[model samples]
Target: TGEMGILWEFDPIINKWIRLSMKLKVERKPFAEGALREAYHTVSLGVGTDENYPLGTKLFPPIEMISPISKNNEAMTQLKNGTKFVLKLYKKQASRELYFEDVKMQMVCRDWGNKFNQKKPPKKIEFLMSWVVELIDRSPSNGQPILCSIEPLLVGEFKKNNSNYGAVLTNRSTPQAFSHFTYELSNKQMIVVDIQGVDDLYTAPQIHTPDGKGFGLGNLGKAGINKFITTHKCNAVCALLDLDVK
Candidate 1:
């Protein structure tokens, strides 16, 4: 039901867009492997060689989503003393690849109510968001930044204005390259990585009208609509621009 395609990115130094092309996997994925799936595999485009995550060190801080905005029991606009992050990509080099010490597993599900139900010829759940950042870290508190947390920004001022620059970075006319991890945060450090695209994606938002022109995009969800993950695959690499709150 999907097709092969190319992706575009950005070159910060060149101040231009680039194409991060794709070559589709042709062989059928093993049936057992398919059944063994658990959650979305979010691979970051980080830097340095992959290594064991540092002992007691966290790649992401933990957070909670308070003041949740949802519809029909689905949460949409949830905020927090819980660490909120400006969605980003990339960072510094010169480190081993690391995964957090004690990571928990979670799933994000949505109710198209019918279109996405266990409607099974294939019998699979259709998760709305592609990336999974906030898990286990959801709760209320003084909202102090913990050792780890990640928040996925969806259908917002960013999406409305196309702030992620998905179109600009991945344009066809652009180069097949772009420079990231070049931001200077004097008081803050960051570990940036590439978003490899969310697989098994689904969303409640109307992606198109019946005529199928780009219409009513960026419309905020009144209910608690958000991303739900089902697997974790990351050969993920990133560039760390290290330095934020402790």
Candidate 2:
């Protein structure tokens, strides 16, 4: 009841959801802030333990526990003490509608990125992966959680780029080419841009559908799609994949 946070994560192996709880080491001051959200260093208990002890095990009581996904030994072997996760709350008072849209857009990007990596004769660069996140816990002032989007804390130098302007093509060229891959793969129906996050992993990506209607305000529709088309420079990876964009 005190400082305990509850959440759920989908376990693909069992095709079911698993329940987990944590003690959020939330401090008043946020470690980072984005255009639309703020980030807090909310460490989960699982992260602060050792392998010998395991996440769910308690040498003593009152330590936070993480529920196992399944009783099966293989499932047990797969058990991992979840890494550090930062809590992201909206700058504007959080709303479920917006939260749903944000997470949905992430899933869309994750799926497309997975598809891109699975393509035959894999390109030199693959889209940076996205991590699993959950919306849980409750706020004292409001029923909804103050820290809404609880996902893995991204490491490495944080960087973001827009659809029209480039982020820097030197080492982080994959984000743009990945966008190209999505567009060509979808037969020009959609293109993902506004690629942002740590190295080899992305978060809060923007998707421009044909109508630009589904993925919130970030979706720039045909205009945004055209911007990427106009500004994107086909790099080695892009040429390797033979992206139709010229």
Candidate 3:
């Protein structure tokens, strides 16, 4: 039998812990790699058994119920028997806190992006609707265990995160403006940059604070913020939201 694994994700909507069961392999070759993590492709067998559920967990409406959906409603569609997912694992010594922090960044950015998309007239903006998952590898790797961040398998040309706007801004104005909106929304306390992903869906973003604290290694701190400011040129998307990144 394939080794068993458990995925843990917190649903803030229902304030419950959700779990998913997946068949995991110990040494699958990663199809992709980034600065801090490597990604392997895998399939989910769907929700875990009832034993993982708390005392009175009722089936709640999916989180996307109140949010936007993909053109084909793929985001809202339930997973099939063997749904594919990308598993991201750290390349060095890992911390559970850092992994959770990364997942939180995804949620925070998704929230901000949703807020930015909400005011659109119609069919004007497509926010990054990506979700990151945390899972524990029950399989033993010789003698050690592993933790991972699982997410949707994004297809198409994968973009690279870069310091220059010209490089990372390869996407349309929406993502750029979304980054700017967060700076303004947070009173310039921080900005969400490194907005790279496949097509309209984003993953592995970095949020830069004043002192570059938190958000793991990608946080470039004030330098990252300054670089964004110097290179950022607001577009029609920014004008729509009354954001002036210049």
Q: Write the per-residue lDDT of candidate 3 for residues 111-215, one digit (tens) a residue.
A: 766677677722233324333343343554454455667667777997754442234546477677777888888998878877777655677778888877887
Instruction: List clash counts for every candidate, in order.
Output: 48, 0, 0
Judge candidate 3 at residue 59 and give its lDDT: 25
Q: For residues 157-232, write the lDDT of model 2, one tens digit per residue.
A: 9777554333444455567678788888898998888776666577777888777687765777787787677667
- The segments of candidate 2 whose C-alpha lies over 4 angstroms from its true place after superposition are 6-23, 46-82, 120-147, 161-171
- Model 2 TM-score, 2 decimals: 0.69
* Candidate 3 stretches greater than 4 Å from native: 12-21, 24-27, 50-80, 121-144, 161-171
Q: Candidate 3 has which clashing residue pairs, if any? A: none
Over the stretch 15-134, how does candidate 1's per-residue lDDT look in tens digits? Answer: 332222221121232111111121221222221111232214342222221112112111122322232322211221211111121111112112221222332323232333222221
For every model shown, what is its TM-score relative to the native structure? Answer: 0.19, 0.69, 0.74
Q: Please list the C-alpha lDDT of all candidates, in the order they appear.
A: 0.21, 0.57, 0.61
| Distance from true location, Cα of 73 in model 3, Å | 17
The parts of candidate 1 lying over 4 Å away from their true place are 1-78, 83-114, 121-123, 127-197, 201-206, 210-214, 217-246
Find the 10 residues in a row with the least total lDDT in model 1. 173-182
Between 1 and 3, whose lDDT is larger? Answer: 3
Which candidate, 1 or 3, has the higher TM-score? 3
Q: How accurate locally is residue 3 in candidate 2, as Cα lDDT from 0 to 100?
A: 55
Error of 2 at 114 (Å): 1.7
